Design a protein around this ligand. Structure first.
Ligand code: CLA
Ligand code: CLA
Ligand code: CLA
Ligand code: CLA
Ligand code: CLA
Ligand code: CLA
Ligand code: CLA
Ligand code: CLA
Ligand code: CLA
Ligand SMILES: CC1=C(/C=C/C(C)=C/C=C/C(C)=C\C=C\C=C(C)\C=C\C=C(C)\C=C\C2=C(C)CCCC2(C)C)C(C)(C)CCC1
Lengths: 339, 68, 73, 141, 338, 340
């Protein structure tokens, strides 16, 4: 949090989520419940889209966003690019919905049974207590999350080179990839044409090198603390670390909005729809190049236009918290307009 | 009460019942209503078409609650 | 004013949807709402009430003033 | 469902009358643009657009977008008139500020009224929006 | 049962079923009367379904829910999957109606003749007295209830292998399942495709494994008290033991609603209806595959959609009682909004 | 600013931008955010015009003013005024808009993390502290900005001669300027017909001798402090340097409005539209020869008419800040009408 020289900050109910930012036990309970709500949406709205799925016509014109994702992974997909099985969508939707109940229970555990501060706890709760101005503990938290993000990227390469197999948007079939690229020189060249790659070997081999980078970066943040140059350059407040995450995920949201609109490999036109035209106006919006009637929208225009608008307002939330971390009151704005 | 020292009128029949009035003076001379209370809102007073009413009225100490 | 100015299509005309819905819940299927008594498959329609063949005939004939058709006027 | 209504693109009374729409403004194709815009609405027996206000988001432009646009502006006019009236009553002569407008104070309040919903929620939480009923001049019953 | 910092807390009449939670004699009286009401529903509505059964059309389209459970067991299904005699369905509902009066006798015995608390009793009534703090007494109760549930699952496999067998859907008639299933990896591999159990031999050997595990846990809980790690992680409150059973039976209600909708063996289409697609809307529901001529629903969908809402509201009732057991009074939420 | 001898003048909110005058750190943050806002408009309205452009019509008929700027500069024209590339306009409109985010970040840096006065800190940044009384420091700023503007004029020389070329409206092609005219006699002779030019070698050669002039003057102002005659004739106050720049940018706004209306080399008729006739009603406006229908105006007639009205009111703003720098209190106009 930002104190503004006040030891006892109050916060009203509309800013009531700021009350537990110094409470490490209740910090878990609001994030596991966020992960409970996130896994519930991946669970309930996969099954919501199963009830609103028709084998006639693609998922793009039906306004579905989750069954296009699992079909590109290569689940329940026919050899002609159609959908033949709604049961692999049902299993993945059931696993996410049941794990939401496990996360929904464990957040209620940390709300009620576990203390608000983990410094009171003795055992393993004592080690999990974090203060916001402890850079050694903060890298332990960051390094362990980089391992699971690295293992998540390796799981995609372990699903396409192995049991599973991704979908190919060129030959319109589900193909297990064999011998992907492993050249570090050609992956440095994909910074330019990142959104028009059109190759499963580059996508999987890209996920190997970024999977090994986050695993290799995960074991560096755990073992090595912040060196001192990062403490001098960056700020280590409660809202400062959130500011870097809000701008970091806004940059990830702007690329993901751009990657959905123009790439055909990871977003096949037989599942999502035709690649969007980057229009602009009172706001940048990726419009339909095929113009579905009755304001339907091809649901590639639902990811790409929401994840720009989400990344825009998460960039403004990044600017809100970086200003508060740097020490801007925002009551000084009204004090500039006084008599 | 005392000069200054704004009070709220509890006299039900008054225009200013529930309004904040400032005590102008207290005439401690055996008066039934010795407390002159001055208001910032004039009442309904005067002949029809008048632009303003009076802002002063005498009150007793039991009809006033201190709010200052 | 817009009728005077030669543009009667510019009139703000609101269909009285909430009172047309109550006409439907008593049985008038003129408005296309399938609710309660206008819907023949509801539990209110299928209860076997002896008023219902006589009531539905009178509410849908239009030759009476039982539940008159209502519009923006 | 509105079975007594028809869409104006398929309404025959609208189609015979949309070809004779009068030009409201100096543009000679004003009635043809109105013929295209009013074709998406729901028309009655004589081809006029019957608006639906029940809360359907298909007909959100019929009432809800006029509702959001009105309540923002009318909440803006009400808030900056309230905030001006609170500001001028702390002065030496609060009476003259209403008949003779403190115009730079008025422009300062009016431009700040774009964040009236976050301000009205804040003044409701602080208790300065609503006065206590025992602190109000009251009729003698 | 909770005691938020105070004793002698009097509950109102709309929450009047909370006063006897410390009363052991009244605890027996309410629960056996619930079992009297449950066995009454098993008996009186079996006779109600017999009085409203027509063998001209399908059983599942009529709306009968107790009779296809007995027809799946291998009773009255001896020729072509068509019901020809209602005497096996009459003899089952008669015993349930007899046992409802037997259970209703001892329930009103315990609220009127037996004392409300069994600590004042002598003899075997002192041994039957329980409280919501004794671990070893509750393990005696839990192990004895696990023994009858294990014997209940073994009696189904005893019926299925010795006393006629069940209705096998792959041959449309009753069949003997006298060969059992013994390999535990077949059962252990059924944590993925338990819904598509198209094998009567694998189902019967599963209930042998369930019946032998539950008597294994029945012997274990009787002869061994709850340990120190179980007391540390599980609250032994009267509301808390209810809270574990509320979520435990809600998990059972969700799985039984999943078995009801999509299975073809334990819920045959000849007696229940076609298997149901798992739809979702505002709430999840199992919509009918085919339409009904009077806007009704099949008995499989009447069982599965009601058991979904019963399991969800018992999960929410588990959430009401777990937060009350831990110490959340629900007046803290309004305490922060000021 | 000007305090009229009152020293501690408190400005109100409508004149709130006068508060950070004589504050070095907030002077950077207001101007970098202006450069953030200017590069944002360059970036966003290039992509706005790309999303509105169609090659079936002309560019000037669609109200497009940023795409003909890049098309004249020697970028992806199809053949003789045809525009089929659409990608180098997207690259330029994306480079300028990412650069606005970097400039938007550096403005919030100098607002918050850097102090309001640069004299408070130490290091290399304390030499960036300027005051509105120091000729040596203000000439250092002027010399480095002349070096940037001189290199910008030489960047057109390098773009035309080497990296691509410029669109020649005479030959309807984009061509390299192989032999620019480096004769100062013909460039000094272009004082009269400056806007009647038609040769790319005269345009590029004129850009070389102003690119060397601004760089040579940029080296001159850095090394040599302002002389004693310039201190006697020019006010070195806060609002005086602004009024010199407001008069200087208004003169450039009049010349650029005159270059837009009548020139065909830097404003070709294929992209911008047909050249304008300088009419005058109650103000000098620029009207087209042929009347574009549906009450629409040519994008050349949109640039030249707006850049005259901008330059007229920036001349009026120059007159506001010159008299305030001279010492006019401007309440004397009220006091003249009070006595009368
Ligand atoms: C409506 C039926 C009914 C009710 C509620 C009563 C009531 C009573 N009987 Mg019982 N009784 C009945 C039928 C009933 N009985 C019949 C048919 C038999 C012969 C088989 C007996 C034989 C009998 C004996 C041998 C004894 C009693 C006695 C008692 C009392 C204690 C309960 C008990 O142990 O025996 C209950 C016995 C039953 C068979 C229970 C049948 C109740 C079923 C479940 C009907 C459903 C209840 C109905 C809705 C009425 C509700 C009333 C109540 C809940 C308010 C209780 C007040 C005791 C006593 O000493 O009383 C003087 C006792 O020792 N009764
Ligand atoms: C990962 C997200 C993240 C995190 C963890 C935080 C965390 C927090 N922020 Mg926030 N912030 C962020 C993103 C983030 N923010 C973004 C995206 C915005 C830009 C809009 C901001 C702007 C911001 C402001 C303006 C404020 C904070 C503050 C707060 C604090 C308390 C807020 C609270 O009580 O919420 C309570 C939640 C509500 C009252 C709900 C409001 C719902 C809004 C009106 C609608 C949003 C949803 C809408 C329906 C759209 C949904 C789209 C979807 C369907 C696709 C807390 C530190 C406060 C602060 O300064 O701390 C003291 C504060 O005043 N934040
Ligand atoms: C992912 C976020 C997260 C975080 C960082 C914590 C953090 C903590 N958990 Mg956990 N917990 C969570 C989610 C989380 N949990 C969820 C999803 C559940 C459900 C499975 C639980 C349920 C849980 C239990 C039941 C227990 C904890 C406890 C622990 C402590 C460490 C125990 C250990 O080292 O185990 C290796 C620590 C306070 C223990 C503790 O000491 O807390 C009181 C404990 O009792 N957790
Ligand atoms: C900006 C000041 C303002 C505000 C916030 C209020 C607030 C209230 N009025 Mg209103 N009212 C005002 C001006 C104001 N009024 C004035 C100027 C008059 C004389 C015309 C009235 C006459 C009045 C009546 C007769 C009624 C209300 C009622 C009410 C309530 C319902 C809201 C509404 O739209 O009523 C409708 C209000 C009007 C039709 C009049 C609005 C007049 C203009 C449009 C308001 C703004 C004018 C002002 C000059 C702006 C100053 C700007 C500043 C920068 C200088 C609400 C408590 C009603 C009530 O008591 O219900 C609980 C009721 O019966 N008011
Ligand atoms: C195995 C079931 C179980 C058990 C034994 C308990 C036990 C207890 N509950 Mg309950 N609880 C559970 C499940 C359970 N509950 C569920 C499923 C819910 C979620 C709905 C809750 C939510 C809950 C609340 C909200 C409260 C309790 C409380 C109570 C206590 C007194 C209740 C009382 O007097 O009833 C009185 C009963 C009534 C007045 C009848 C109400 C009937 C409603 C309207 C439902 C009617 C049926 C409905 C139409 C559906 C029909 C289904 C169809 C198939 C027939 C008691 C200790 C209270 C407590 O502990 O506070 C001290 C309390 O306030 N319970
Ligand atoms: C299934 C639940 C159950 C439980 C928890 C109890 C528990 C008990 N019963 Mg029992 N009772 C019940 C239901 C139950 N009963 C039913 C269904 C009936 C049959 C109608 C009775 C009829 C009954 C009688 C008639 C007697 C007991 C008695 C007893 C006590 C000692 C039992 C004994 O001697 O060992 C075996 C004990 C409190 C005795 C007791 O203590 O009563 C005062 C006693 O006299 N009960
Ligand atoms: C109907 C289900 C049921 C119930 C309600 C219980 C309840 C209990 N079991 Mg369990 N148990 C059962 C069936 C059941 N058991 C069966 C079928 C077996 C397998 C043979 C066992 C064997 C078992 C072991 C071996 C242990 C438990 C233990 C426990 C306790 C810890 C729970 C825990 O941490 O879970 C997660 C809890 C009181 C522990 C305990 O306290 O034993 C008394 C213990 O060590 N259980
Ligand atoms: C490079 C531009 C430049 C610079 C940096 C300054 C800087 C300054 N001037 Mg300004 N001035 C200039 C140009 C410049 N001016 C121009 C072009 C005008 C002619 C109109 C003037 C005339 C002017 C006056 C009359 C005043 C100043 C004053 C000020 C000071 C405070 C300004 C403030 O807070 O207003 C904040 C801005 C506003 C409150 C907005 C005012 C609303 C207007 C109407 C907006 C114009 C909208 C217009 C339609 C824009 C669209 C154009 C086109 C696209 C259609 C500050 C030192 C003040 C002074 O003397 O210092 C104390 C003062 O009173 N200047
Ligand atoms: C963007 C244009 C720019 C700006 C704003 C200035 C501004 C200044 N020049 Mg100039 N100058 C520049 C470009 C510029 N120059 C270039 C292009 C050259 C090369 C020809 C010079 C070379 C130069 C000379 C040789 C001198 C000036 C001088 C001056 C000052 C007196 C102004 C004057 O002559 O009044 C009318 C003034 C501070 C004098 C000064 O103080 O410089 C140290 C001086 O002696 N300038
Ligand atoms: C949805 C919808 C609807 C409905 C509606 C409703 C029904 C509503 C309600 C509402 C209501 C029932 C309300 C109430 C309220 C109350 C109160 C209590 C109020 C208060 C207010 C206030 C307080 C105010 C203030 C202010 C502001 C805010 C601003 C300006 C100024 C002033 C001061 C005025 C309809 C059908 C139409 C249509 C469709 C949609």
């Amino acid at each position: 949090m930002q104190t503004y020289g006040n030891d006892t900050v109050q916060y009203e109910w509309w800013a009531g989520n700021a009350r537990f930012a110094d409470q490490s036990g209740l910090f878990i309970a609001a994030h596991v419940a966020q992960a409970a709500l996130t896994a519930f949406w991946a669970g309930a709205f996969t099954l919501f889209e199963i009830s609103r799925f028709d084998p006639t016509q693609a998922m793009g014109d039906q306004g579905l966003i989750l069954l296009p994702h699992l079909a590109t992974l290569g689940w329940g997909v026919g050899d002609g690019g159609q959908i033949v099985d709604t049961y692999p969508y049902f299993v993945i939707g059931s696993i996410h919905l049941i794990a939401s109940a496990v996360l929904g229970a464990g957040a209620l555990f940390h709300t009620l049974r576990a203390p608000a501060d983990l410094s009171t706890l003795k055992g393993q709760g004592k080690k999990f207590h974090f203060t916001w101005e402890n850079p050694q503990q903060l890298g332990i938290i960051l390094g362990h999350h980089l391992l699971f993000l690295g293992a998540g990227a390796l799981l995609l390469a372990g699903k396409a080179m192995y049991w599973g197999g991704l979908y190919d948007a060129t030959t319109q079939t589900v193909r297990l990839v064999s011998q992907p690229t492993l050249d570090p020189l050609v992956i440095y060249g994909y910074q330019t044409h990142f959104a028009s790659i059109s190759s499963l070997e580059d996508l999987v081999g890209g996920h190997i090198f970024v999977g090994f980078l986050l695993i290799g970066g995960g074991i560096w943040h755990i073992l090595v603390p912040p060196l001192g140059w990062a403490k001098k350059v960056l700020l280590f407040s409660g809202e400062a670390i959130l500011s870097y995450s809000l701008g970091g995920i806004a940059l990830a949201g702007f690329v993901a909005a751009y990657f959905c609109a123009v790439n055909t490999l990871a977003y096949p036109p037989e599942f999502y729809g035709p690649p969007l035209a980057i229009k602009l106006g009172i706001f940048p919006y990726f419009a339909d190049t095929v113009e579905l009637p009755m304001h339907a929208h091809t649901s590639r225009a639902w990811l790409a236009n929401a994840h720009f608008f989400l990344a825009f307002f998460f960039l403004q939330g990044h600017l809100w918290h970086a200003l508060r971390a740097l020490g801007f009151d925002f009551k000084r704005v009204e004090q500039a307009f006084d008599s | 009460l005392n000069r200054g020292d704004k009070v709220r009128i509890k006299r039900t029949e008054s225009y200013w019942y529930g309004d904040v009035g400032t005590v102008a003076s207290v005439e401690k001379s055996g008066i039934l209503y010795p407390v002159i209370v001055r208001f910032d809102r004039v009442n309904y007073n005067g002949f029809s078409g008048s632009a303003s009413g009076v802002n002063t009225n005498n009150f007793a100490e039991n009809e006033l609650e201190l709010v200052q | 004013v817009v009728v005077a100015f030669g543009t009667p299509e510019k009139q703000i005309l609101i269909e009285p949807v909430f009172a047309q819905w109550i006409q439907a819940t008593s049985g008038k299927a003129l408005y296309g709402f399938d609710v309660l008594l206008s819907n023949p498959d509801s539990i209110a329609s299928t209860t076997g009430a002896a008023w219902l063949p006589g009531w539905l005939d009178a509410i849908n004939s239009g030759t009476n003033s039982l539940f008159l058709t209502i519009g923006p006027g | 469902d509105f079975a007594n209504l028809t869409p104006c693109s398929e309404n025959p009374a609208y189609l015979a009358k949309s070809k004779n729409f009068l030009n409201t403004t100096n543009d000679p194709n004003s009635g043809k643009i109105r013929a295209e815009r009013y074709a998406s609405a729901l028309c009655g027996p004589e081809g006029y657009p019957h608006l639906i206000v029940d809360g359907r988001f298909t007909h959100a432009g019929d009432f809800l977008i006029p509702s959001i646009l009105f309540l923002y502006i009318a909440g803006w006019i009400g808030w900056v008139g309230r905030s001006y009236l609170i500001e001028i009553r702390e002065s030496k002569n609060p009476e003259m500020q209403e008949v003779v407008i403190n115009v730079p104070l008025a422009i300062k309040k009016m431009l700040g009224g774009f964040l009236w919903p976050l301000a009205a929620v804040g003044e409701y939480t602080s208790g300065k929006l609503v006065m206590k009923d025992s602190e109000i001049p009251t009729s003698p019953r």
